[PDB]
Coordinates of C-alpha atoms in Angstrom, one line a residue:
Chain X
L1 CA 143.7 93.4 69.1
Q2 CA 145.9 90.5 68.0
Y3 CA 144.6 89.1 64.7
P4 CA 142.7 86.0 66.0
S5 CA 144.8 82.8 66.0
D6 CA 141.5 80.7 66.0
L7 CA 138.6 81.9 63.8
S8 CA 136.4 78.8 64.7
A9 CA 132.6 79.6 64.7
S10 CA 129.9 78.0 66.9
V11 CA 126.2 78.2 67.6
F12 CA 126.9 78.0 71.3
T13 CA 130.2 78.9 73.1
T14 CA 131.4 78.8 76.7
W15 CA 134.2 81.3 77.8
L16 CA 135.7 81.9 81.3
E17 CA 135.7 85.3 82.9
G18 CA 138.9 86.1 84.9
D19 CA 141.3 83.6 86.6
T20 CA 141.3 79.7 86.1
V21 CA 140.7 77.7 89.3
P22 CA 142.8 74.4 89.2
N23 CA 140.5 71.3 88.7
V24 CA 137.4 73.5 88.3
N25 CA 136.8 73.2 84.5
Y26 CA 133.1 74.0 84.4
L27 CA 131.1 77.3 84.5
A28 CA 128.2 78.3 86.8
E29 CA 125.4 75.8 87.2
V30 CA 122.4 75.9 84.9
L31 CA 119.4 75.0 87.1
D32 CA 116.6 74.6 84.4
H33 CA 118.0 75.1 80.9
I34 CA 119.9 77.0 78.3
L35 CA 117.2 76.4 75.7
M36 CA 118.1 76.9 72.0
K37 CA 114.9 76.2 70.0
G38 CA 113.5 77.2 66.7
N39 CA 116.5 79.0 65.3
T40 CA 118.0 79.0 61.9
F41 CA 121.8 78.6 61.8
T42 CA 123.3 78.9 58.3
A43 CA 127.0 79.0 57.7
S44 CA 128.4 80.5 54.5
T45 CA 130.1 78.2 52.0
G46 CA 133.4 80.0 52.6
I47 CA 133.4 79.7 56.5
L48 CA 132.4 76.0 56.2
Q49 CA 135.4 75.4 53.9
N50 CA 138.0 77.5 55.9
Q51 CA 137.0 77.0 59.6
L52 CA 135.5 74.6 62.2
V53 CA 131.7 75.5 62.5
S54 CA 130.3 73.7 65.5
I55 CA 127.0 73.5 67.5
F56 CA 128.9 73.6 70.9
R57 CA 132.4 75.1 71.5
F58 CA 134.2 74.9 74.9
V59 CA 137.0 77.5 75.1
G60 CA 139.0 76.8 78.3
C61 CA 135.8 75.9 80.2
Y62 CA 132.5 74.1 79.5
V63 CA 129.0 73.9 81.0
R64 CA 128.0 70.6 82.6
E65 CA 124.2 71.0 83.0
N66 CA 121.0 71.4 81.0
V67 CA 122.0 72.5 77.5
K68 CA 118.9 72.0 75.3
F69 CA 119.2 72.2 71.5
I70 CA 115.7 71.5 70.1
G71 CA 114.0 72.1 66.8
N72 CA 116.7 74.1 65.1
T73 CA 117.7 74.2 61.4
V74 CA 121.5 73.9 61.3
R75 CA 124.2 74.1 58.6
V76 CA 127.6 73.3 60.3
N77 CA 130.7 71.0 59.8
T78 CA 131.1 69.4 63.3
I79 CA 129.0 69.1 66.5
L80 CA 131.5 69.8 69.3
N81 CA 134.7 71.9 69.2
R82 CA 136.5 71.5 72.5
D83 CA 139.6 73.2 73.9
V84 CA 139.1 72.2 77.6
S85 CA 140.4 69.7 80.2
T86 CA 137.6 67.5 81.7
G87 CA 140.0 65.1 83.5
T88 CA 138.4 65.3 87.1
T89 CA 135.8 63.2 88.9
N90 CA 133.6 66.4 88.7
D91 CA 133.5 66.6 84.9
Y92 CA 130.3 65.3 83.4
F93 CA 127.3 66.2 81.3
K94 CA 123.9 66.2 83.2
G95 CA 120.5 66.8 81.6
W96 CA 121.6 67.8 78.1
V97 CA 118.8 67.5 75.4
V98 CA 119.6 67.4 71.7
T99 CA 116.6 66.4 69.6
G100 CA 114.3 67.4 66.6
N101 CA 117.0 69.4 64.7
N102 CA 117.2 69.5 60.9
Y103 CA 120.9 69.1 59.9
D104 CA 122.7 70.1 56.6
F105 CA 126.0 68.2 57.1
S106 CA 126.9 68.5 53.3
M107 CA 130.3 70.1 54.3
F108 CA 130.9 67.9 57.4
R109 CA 134.7 68.0 58.3
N110 CA 136.6 65.0 57.0
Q111 CA 138.7 62.9 59.5
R112 CA 136.9 64.5 62.5
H113 CA 134.4 62.9 65.0
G114 CA 131.2 65.0 65.3
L115 CA 131.3 65.0 69.2
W116 CA 134.3 63.3 71.0
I117 CA 134.8 64.0 74.7
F118 CA 136.5 62.3 77.7
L119 CA 134.3 62.7 80.9
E120 CA 133.8 61.0 84.2
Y121 CA 130.2 60.2 83.1
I122 CA 127.1 61.5 81.5
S123 CA 123.8 61.5 83.3
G124 CA 120.1 62.0 82.3
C125 CA 121.2 63.0 78.8
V126 CA 119.3 62.7 75.5
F127 CA 121.4 62.8 72.3
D128 CA 118.9 62.2 69.5
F129 CA 120.4 62.9 66.0
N130 CA 117.8 62.3 63.2
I131 CA 119.8 63.3 60.0
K132 CA 118.4 63.9 56.5
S133 CA 121.5 65.3 54.8
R134 CA 123.9 64.9 52.0
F135 CA 127.5 64.3 53.2
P136 CA 130.9 64.6 51.6
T137 CA 133.1 61.5 51.1
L138 CA 134.3 61.0 54.6
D139 CA 136.9 58.6 56.0
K140 CA 134.4 55.9 57.2
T141 CA 136.4 55.1 60.5
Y142 CA 135.3 58.2 62.4
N143 CA 132.1 58.5 64.6
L144 CA 129.2 61.1 64.8
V145 CA 129.3 60.7 68.6
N146 CA 132.1 59.2 70.7
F147 CA 131.9 59.4 74.6
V148 CA 134.9 58.2 76.6
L149 CA 133.5 57.8 80.1
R150 CA 135.8 56.9 83.0
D151 CA 133.2 55.8 85.6
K152 CA 130.5 53.6 84.1
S153 CA 128.9 53.2 87.6
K154 CA 127.8 56.9 87.3
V155 CA 126.6 56.7 83.6
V156 CA 122.9 56.7 84.2
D157 CA 119.5 57.6 82.6
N158 CA 120.9 58.3 79.1
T159 CA 119.4 57.9 75.7
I160 CA 121.6 58.0 72.5
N161 CA 119.5 57.7 69.3
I162 CA 121.3 58.2 65.9
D163 CA 119.2 57.8 62.8
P164 CA 121.3 58.7 59.7
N165 CA 118.2 57.7 57.4
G166 CA 119.5 57.2 53.8
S167 CA 123.1 58.2 54.8
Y168 CA 123.7 55.0 56.9
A169 CA 126.7 53.9 54.7
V170 CA 128.7 57.2 55.2
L171 CA 130.3 56.0 58.5
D172 CA 130.9 52.4 59.5
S173 CA 130.0 53.1 63.2
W174 CA 127.8 56.2 63.9
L175 CA 128.5 55.7 67.7
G176 CA 132.0 55.1 69.0
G177 CA 133.6 54.9 72.5
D178 CA 132.7 53.3 75.9
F179 CA 128.9 52.6 75.3
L180 CA 130.2 50.0 72.7
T181 CA 131.5 47.9 75.7
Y182 CA 128.4 48.1 78.0
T183 CA 126.9 44.9 79.3
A184 CA 123.3 44.6 80.4
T185 CA 124.4 45.8 84.0
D186 CA 125.9 49.0 82.5
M187 CA 123.2 49.7 79.8
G188 CA 119.5 48.8 80.9
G189 CA 120.7 48.1 84.5
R190 CA 121.5 51.9 84.8
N191 CA 118.6 53.1 82.5
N192 CA 120.9 53.7 79.5
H193 CA 119.4 53.1 76.1
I194 CA 121.1 53.2 72.7
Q195 CA 119.8 53.1 69.1
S196 CA 122.4 53.5 66.4
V197 CA 123.5 52.2 63.0
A198 CA 126.6 50.2 62.1
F199 CA 128.2 48.3 59.3
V200 CA 128.6 44.6 60.5
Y201 CA 130.0 41.2 59.6
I202 CA 127.3 38.5 59.5
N203 CA 128.5 34.8 59.5
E204 CA 126.1 32.7 57.3
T205 CA 126.4 28.9 58.0
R206 CA 124.5 26.2 56.1
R207 CA 124.4 22.4 56.8
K208 CA 124.2 19.7 54.1
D209 CA 120.5 18.4 53.9
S210 CA 119.2 21.4 56.0
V211 CA 116.9 24.2 54.8
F212 CA 118.2 26.6 57.7
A213 CA 121.0 29.2 57.2
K214 CA 122.2 30.3 60.7
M215 CA 123.1 34.0 60.6
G216 CA 125.4 35.5 63.3
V217 CA 126.3 39.2 63.7
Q218 CA 129.9 39.9 64.9
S219 CA 131.0 43.5 65.5
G220 CA 133.0 45.5 68.1
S221 CA 130.4 48.3 67.1
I222 CA 127.4 46.5 68.7
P223 CA 127.5 46.5 72.6
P224 CA 127.1 43.1 74.2
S225 CA 123.8 44.6 75.7
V226 CA 122.2 44.7 72.2
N227 CA 118.5 43.4 72.4
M228 CA 117.9 43.3 68.6
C229 CA 118.7 44.8 65.2
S230 CA 116.8 45.5 62.0
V231 CA 118.6 45.1 58.7
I232 CA 118.8 48.3 56.6
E233 CA 120.8 46.7 53.7
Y234 CA 122.4 43.4 53.0
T235 CA 125.3 44.6 50.9
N236 CA 125.8 41.2 49.1
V237 CA 123.6 39.3 46.6
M238 CA 122.6 36.2 48.7
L239 CA 120.8 32.9 47.8
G240 CA 117.8 33.1 45.5
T241 CA 116.0 30.2 47.3
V242 CA 116.4 31.7 50.7
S243 CA 113.9 33.9 52.8
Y244 CA 116.5 36.1 54.8
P245 CA 115.5 37.5 58.2
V246 CA 115.2 41.3 58.4
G247 CA 115.3 41.3 62.3
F248 CA 117.9 39.6 64.7
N249 CA 117.4 38.9 68.3
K250 CA 120.1 38.7 71.1
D251 CA 122.2 35.4 70.7
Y252 CA 121.7 33.9 74.3
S253 CA 124.8 31.6 73.6
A254 CA 127.0 34.8 73.2
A255 CA 128.6 33.0 70.2
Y256 CA 127.5 36.2 68.3
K257 CA 125.9 39.4 69.4
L258 CA 122.7 38.7 67.4
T259 CA 121.4 35.7 65.6
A260 CA 118.6 34.8 63.2
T261 CA 117.8 31.9 60.8
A262 CA 117.1 32.2 57.1
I263 CA 114.9 29.4 55.4
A264 CA 115.6 27.7 52.1
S265 CA 112.9 26.5 49.5
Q266 CA 115.1 23.3 48.9
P267 CA 117.7 21.7 51.3
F268 CA 121.5 22.7 50.9
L269 CA 123.6 20.3 48.8
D270 CA 126.7 20.7 51.2
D271 CA 128.3 22.4 54.2
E272 CA 129.2 26.0 53.4
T273 CA 130.0 29.4 55.1
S274 CA 129.4 32.8 53.6
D275 CA 130.9 36.1 54.8
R276 CA 128.1 38.7 54.7
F277 CA 128.2 42.5 55.4
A278 CA 125.1 44.5 56.3
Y279 CA 124.1 47.9 57.6
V280 CA 122.0 47.3 60.8
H281 CA 119.9 49.5 63.1
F282 CA 120.5 48.1 66.6
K283 CA 118.8 48.8 70.0
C284 CA 120.2 48.2 73.5
Chain K
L1 CA 89.4 85.7 99.5
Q2 CA 89.2 82.3 101.1
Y3 CA 92.7 80.7 101.3
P4 CA 92.4 78.3 98.2
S5 CA 91.4 74.7 99.2
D6 CA 92.9 73.5 95.8
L7 CA 96.3 74.9 94.8
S8 CA 96.5 72.5 91.7
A9 CA 98.4 74.1 88.7
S10 CA 97.8 73.5 85.0
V11 CA 99.0 74.5 81.6
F12 CA 95.4 74.7 80.4
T13 CA 92.3 75.1 82.6
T14 CA 88.5 75.3 81.8
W15 CA 86.3 77.3 84.3
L16 CA 82.5 78.0 84.1
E17 CA 81.2 81.6 84.2
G18 CA 77.9 81.9 86.1
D19 CA 75.1 79.2 86.6
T20 CA 75.5 75.5 86.0
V21 CA 73.0 74.1 83.4
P22 CA 72.0 70.5 84.4
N23 CA 73.5 67.9 81.9
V24 CA 75.4 70.6 80.0
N25 CA 79.0 69.9 81.3
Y26 CA 80.9 71.5 78.3
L27 CA 81.9 75.1 77.5
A28 CA 81.3 77.0 74.2
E29 CA 82.3 75.2 71.0
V30 CA 85.8 75.6 69.6
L31 CA 85.3 75.7 65.8
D32 CA 89.1 75.5 64.6
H33 CA 91.5 75.2 67.6
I34 CA 92.8 76.2 70.9
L35 CA 96.4 75.8 69.7
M36 CA 99.1 75.7 72.3
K37 CA 102.4 75.4 70.4
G38 CA 106.1 76.1 71.0
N39 CA 105.8 77.0 74.7
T40 CA 108.1 76.2 77.5
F41 CA 106.2 75.0 80.7
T42 CA 108.6 74.5 83.7
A43 CA 107.2 73.7 87.1
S44 CA 109.3 74.4 90.2
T45 CA 110.6 71.4 92.2
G46 CA 108.5 72.5 95.2
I47 CA 105.2 72.8 93.3
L48 CA 105.8 69.4 91.6
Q49 CA 106.3 67.8 95.1
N50 CA 103.3 69.6 96.8
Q51 CA 100.6 69.9 94.1
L52 CA 99.1 68.3 91.0
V53 CA 100.7 70.0 87.9
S54 CA 98.7 69.0 84.8
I55 CA 98.6 69.8 81.1
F56 CA 94.7 69.9 81.1
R57 CA 92.5 70.7 84.1
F58 CA 88.6 70.7 84.0
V59 CA 87.1 72.7 86.9
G60 CA 83.3 72.0 87.0
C61 CA 83.3 72.0 83.1
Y62 CA 85.5 71.0 80.2
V63 CA 85.9 71.7 76.5
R64 CA 84.9 68.9 74.0
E65 CA 86.5 70.2 70.8
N66 CA 89.8 71.0 69.0
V67 CA 92.3 71.4 71.9
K68 CA 95.8 71.2 70.1
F69 CA 98.9 70.8 72.3
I70 CA 101.8 70.6 69.8
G71 CA 105.6 71.1 70.1
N72 CA 105.8 72.2 73.7
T73 CA 108.6 71.6 76.3
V74 CA 106.7 70.5 79.5
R75 CA 107.7 69.7 83.1
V76 CA 104.5 68.4 84.9
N77 CA 103.4 65.4 87.2
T78 CA 100.2 64.4 85.5
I79 CA 98.4 64.9 82.1
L80 CA 94.7 65.5 83.1
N81 CA 93.3 66.9 86.4
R82 CA 89.5 66.5 86.2
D83 CA 86.8 67.8 88.6
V84 CA 83.8 67.5 86.1
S85 CA 80.8 65.1 85.4
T86 CA 80.9 63.8 81.8
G87 CA 78.1 61.3 82.3
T88 CA 75.8 62.2 79.3
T89 CA 75.5 61.1 75.7
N90 CA 76.8 64.6 74.8
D91 CA 80.1 64.3 76.6
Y92 CA 83.0 63.5 74.2
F93 CA 86.3 64.7 72.9
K94 CA 86.3 65.6 69.2
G95 CA 89.4 66.7 67.2
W96 CA 92.0 66.9 70.0
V97 CA 95.6 66.8 68.9
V98 CA 98.4 66.0 71.3
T99 CA 101.8 65.5 69.5
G100 CA 105.5 66.5 69.2
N101 CA 105.9 67.5 72.9
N102 CA 109.1 67.1 74.9
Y103 CA 108.1 65.7 78.4
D104 CA 110.1 65.9 81.7
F105 CA 108.0 63.3 83.8
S106 CA 110.8 62.9 86.4
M107 CA 108.4 63.9 89.2
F108 CA 105.3 62.1 87.7
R109 CA 102.7 61.5 90.5
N110 CA 102.8 58.0 91.9
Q111 CA 99.5 55.9 92.0
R112 CA 97.8 58.2 89.5
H113 CA 96.9 57.6 85.8
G114 CA 98.2 60.3 83.4
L115 CA 94.8 60.9 81.7
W116 CA 91.8 58.9 83.0
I117 CA 88.3 60.0 81.8
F118 CA 84.8 58.4 81.4
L119 CA 83.2 59.8 78.1
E120 CA 80.4 58.7 75.7
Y121 CA 83.1 58.5 73.0
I122 CA 86.2 60.2 71.5
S123 CA 86.1 61.1 67.8
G124 CA 88.8 62.3 65.3
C125 CA 91.4 62.5 68.1
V126 CA 95.2 62.2 68.0
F127 CA 97.0 61.4 71.3
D128 CA 100.6 60.9 70.4
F129 CA 102.9 60.7 73.5
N130 CA 106.7 60.3 72.5
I131 CA 108.4 60.4 75.9
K132 CA 112.2 60.7 76.6
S133 CA 112.2 61.2 80.3
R134 CA 113.4 59.9 83.6
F135 CA 110.6 58.7 85.8
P136 CA 110.3 58.1 89.6
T137 CA 109.6 54.5 90.9
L138 CA 105.9 54.2 90.1
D139 CA 103.4 51.6 91.0
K140 CA 103.5 49.7 87.6
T141 CA 99.6 48.9 87.6
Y142 CA 98.6 52.5 86.5
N143 CA 98.3 53.8 82.9
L144 CA 99.6 56.9 81.1
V145 CA 96.2 57.1 79.2
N146 CA 92.9 55.4 80.2
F147 CA 89.7 56.1 78.3
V148 CA 86.5 54.6 79.5
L149 CA 84.1 55.1 76.5
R150 CA 80.4 54.1 76.9
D151 CA 79.4 54.0 73.2
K152 CA 82.0 52.2 71.1
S153 CA 79.8 52.7 68.0
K154 CA 80.6 56.5 68.2
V155 CA 84.4 56.0 68.8
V156 CA 85.7 56.8 65.4
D157 CA 88.8 58.2 63.5
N158 CA 91.1 58.1 66.5
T159 CA 94.9 57.5 66.8
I160 CA 96.6 56.7 70.1
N161 CA 100.4 56.4 69.9
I162 CA 102.4 56.0 73.1
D163 CA 106.2 55.6 72.7
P164 CA 107.9 55.6 76.1
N165 CA 111.3 55.0 74.4
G166 CA 113.8 53.6 77.1
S167 CA 111.2 54.0 79.9
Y168 CA 109.0 51.1 78.5
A169 CA 109.4 49.1 81.8
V170 CA 108.1 51.9 84.1
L171 CA 104.4 50.9 83.6
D172 CA 103.1 47.4 82.8
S173 CA 100.4 48.8 80.4
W174 CA 101.0 52.4 79.0
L175 CA 97.3 52.3 77.7
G176 CA 94.4 51.2 79.9
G177 CA 90.6 51.1 79.5
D178 CA 88.1 50.2 76.8
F179 CA 90.4 50.3 73.7
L180 CA 92.0 47.2 75.2
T181 CA 88.7 45.3 74.4
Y182 CA 88.3 46.5 70.8
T183 CA 87.8 43.9 68.1
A184 CA 88.6 44.5 64.4
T185 CA 85.0 45.9 64.0
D186 CA 85.6 48.5 66.8
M187 CA 89.2 49.4 65.9
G188 CA 90.1 49.5 62.1
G189 CA 86.4 49.0 61.2
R190 CA 85.8 52.6 62.7
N191 CA 89.2 54.0 61.6
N192 CA 90.7 53.7 65.2
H193 CA 94.5 52.9 65.3
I194 CA 96.5 52.2 68.4
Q195 CA 100.3 51.9 69.0
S196 CA 101.4 51.3 72.5
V197 CA 103.8 49.3 74.8
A198 CA 103.0 46.6 77.3
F199 CA 104.6 43.9 79.5
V200 CA 103.3 40.5 78.3
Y201 CA 103.3 36.8 79.1
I202 CA 104.7 34.7 76.1
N203 CA 104.0 30.9 76.2
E204 CA 107.0 29.1 74.6
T205 CA 106.2 25.4 73.6
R206 CA 108.7 23.0 72.2
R207 CA 108.0 19.4 70.8
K208 CA 110.5 16.4 71.2
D209 CA 112.4 16.0 67.9
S210 CA 111.3 19.5 66.6
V211 CA 113.5 22.5 65.8
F212 CA 110.4 24.9 66.2
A213 CA 109.5 26.7 69.5
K214 CA 105.9 28.1 69.1
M215 CA 105.6 31.5 70.9
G216 CA 102.2 32.8 71.9
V217 CA 101.5 36.3 73.4
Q218 CA 98.7 36.3 76.1
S219 CA 97.7 39.6 77.7
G220 CA 94.5 41.5 78.6
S221 CA 96.7 44.6 77.7
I222 CA 96.7 43.8 73.9
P223 CA 93.4 44.3 72.1
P224 CA 92.0 41.3 70.1
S225 CA 92.4 43.7 67.1
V226 CA 96.2 43.6 67.3
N227 CA 97.9 43.2 63.9
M228 CA 101.5 42.7 65.1
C229 CA 104.1 43.5 67.8
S230 CA 107.8 44.1 67.8
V231 CA 109.8 42.8 70.9
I232 CA 111.5 45.6 72.9
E233 CA 113.0 43.3 75.5
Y234 CA 112.8 39.6 76.3
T235 CA 113.2 39.8 80.1
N236 CA 114.5 36.2 80.5
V237 CA 117.7 34.4 79.3
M238 CA 116.3 32.0 76.7
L239 CA 117.8 29.0 74.7
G240 CA 121.4 29.6 73.3
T241 CA 120.7 27.3 70.3
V242 CA 117.5 29.2 69.3
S243 CA 117.0 32.2 66.8
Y244 CA 114.0 34.0 68.6
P245 CA 111.6 36.1 66.6
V246 CA 111.6 39.9 67.2
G247 CA 108.2 40.4 65.4
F248 CA 104.8 38.6 66.1
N249 CA 101.8 38.5 63.7
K250 CA 98.1 38.1 64.6
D251 CA 97.4 34.5 65.7
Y252 CA 94.4 33.6 63.3
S253 CA 93.5 30.6 65.6
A254 CA 92.8 33.2 68.4
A255 CA 94.6 30.7 70.8
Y256 CA 96.9 33.7 71.5
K257 CA 96.7 37.4 70.5
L258 CA 100.0 37.1 68.6
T259 CA 102.2 34.1 67.6
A260 CA 105.7 33.5 66.1
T261 CA 108.0 30.6 65.8
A262 CA 111.7 30.4 67.0
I263 CA 114.1 28.0 65.2
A264 CA 116.7 25.7 67.0
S265 CA 120.2 24.8 65.6
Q266 CA 119.5 21.2 66.9
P267 CA 116.2 19.4 67.6
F268 CA 114.7 19.5 71.2
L269 CA 115.3 16.4 73.4
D270 CA 111.8 16.5 74.9
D271 CA 108.4 18.2 75.3
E272 CA 108.8 21.4 77.4
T273 CA 106.9 24.7 78.1
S274 CA 108.6 28.0 79.2
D275 CA 106.9 31.0 80.8
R276 CA 108.5 34.1 79.1
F277 CA 107.9 37.8 79.9
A278 CA 108.6 40.5 77.3
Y279 CA 108.1 44.2 76.7
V280 CA 106.3 44.6 73.3
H281 CA 105.4 47.5 71.0
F282 CA 102.0 46.5 69.5
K283 CA 99.9 48.0 66.7
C284 CA 96.2 47.7 66.0

């Protein structure tokens, strides 16, 4: 035995028996489920420091269908470790379920996406991450989940739901990748639904002699398909005399993604703009 | 053995040993629970196509008390299959708990209510359906849950919570039946609480020279006891210059169930009405 060049650990791993078949990157079809439920997965302090410790690892192959990770207690430092090509029109996820897990991400790897994969599509998937964890000080530019999906016409029936609870500020955009570009045709038109959290610019404009402050959310992190957002935290002290909205609706003008109107106690003395920054929970 | 006339399948079934007793439709009392927890219930494709596959089936009898269905993974095509009379003042559910289940309703029966029963009342029940599933193309006029309850004075201490997540549009009214008629006296007055989803008409009225668009929810699917609703989806493109509410409060005038006010950037040029349609999440 060679001393292992890769001492990565994972809850779940795919490995290939015998010869590679060119362009056939996936393993034997799962017809109902690989159902991982109710387990306790605890990584040692020392392995969390020294290795990648994933939920899913793909070693020269992966499984397309029906992986179900439900109701587990998990201490790990990343979600997906992949060493596989998934470059073909036959590479997809179908029917994955991730939900109801309890995460300790207190030693989450810095400068690493949780789950970042390039597929043809994902279909009939549920990726529900409800996190109540400490985190280390991460670079805030990486994503928990990032799907690059080459054929949006085949991206159907998916739910992505990321709820970082009190950890909302750890990453600027919990969700990265192609879902961020989906229009109504691509998102609800194909039964795709997203709930996620992002740090956003809000334009606040006030007119002389008005009591209204028009508030406009602008962010490449919110898909143009967004229906609404709820405010988690306005990061700035704002006007004392103003009742600020806590929900935003879709901006039908498309000037912004989302728009609401705050109301003043007394009219504004002059025309002014404010640059605001908020953490929002959005739904498409 | 006769070839079975009814090849219905169910997770849970009630059957009667020996003679019927007239007007005694229920089986022996459950004092704490029949607790079904943590199971995996997978129906074959072929049985889902060819039979009713229920969670609960009542064959010439039923159980009134303390059925607990918690934390199961379930593939079925209906919730309740009943072949029982429950016509007496002694027919009720008491202390049922349905919550935390993971549903595959991708072969849900068309033109069939999930759970439709006529009882004297239900008491101290929790019916919490959090669904993340594909569905087939259903007739949108049927209900997931429909309780007909003959004595509202005995309907106490109940919670019904239906969260269809991204599937909100599959049925016009997730909840049907007598709870839709409950006033404040019948609902919070007896410690009944409802959270459900429905497709609703919203009246939008705008006055010449006003910046306000009065929005009024009208629907036989919302009980008059409604406290509030959150908007899941406005189905229409609406005014570009308007900040539309995402929450509605109870309309104290009772002109509508629920009312909110949208705010324009510029006043309206004339008096106009718009017929709007939205999916709402409501709470009583």
